[PDB]
Amino acid sequence: KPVSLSYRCPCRFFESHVARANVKHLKILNTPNCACQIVARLKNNNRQVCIDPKLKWIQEYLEKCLNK
Template sequence: MPALPGSSTQTSVHSWIHSQTEHSSRANNMDLRTLAVLTILLGTICYSEEKPVSLSYRCPCRYFESNVAKSNIKHLRILSTTNCSLQIVARLKHSGKQICLDPKIKWIQEYLDKALNKKVKT
């Protein structure tokens, strides 16, 4: 026998549908919150995989060589950062080894003076 409009069967079905819709809405909100929290956590983990601040700002030259002949140098790299004083990294011709040169070496100072004067003229 079909239920009449306004009968208890129709009301209970309507209540059940309404409760399921509410439950689904709460579940969607929960899923969005969970997704947001996971995104933040993953972002934090990815960011923390970077080098620690103390390592990323460490100066490349901790020790300086001062008894290196100019003829033994294959090429020079001059590094200057806000955290480090003038750093001069040289690659040796024969061994290929990289060393840090003391910026107070006379031929280094002459080289730097020439390089700076050349930049001023251009």
């Protein structure tokens, strides 16, 4: 469900025990008026969870996108 919506953000609460080693990939949702919505899909036994860009490893994930 890719919900591009404003003010009410798809992720109000975020998963905070997320580990990049467990994250298979990240998903950044498009919200016209919300902060960067980031989803972490975790490997095999876990589910897909929504997390927050406050997470420092998240920023590094995207830092890898930046200038390589």
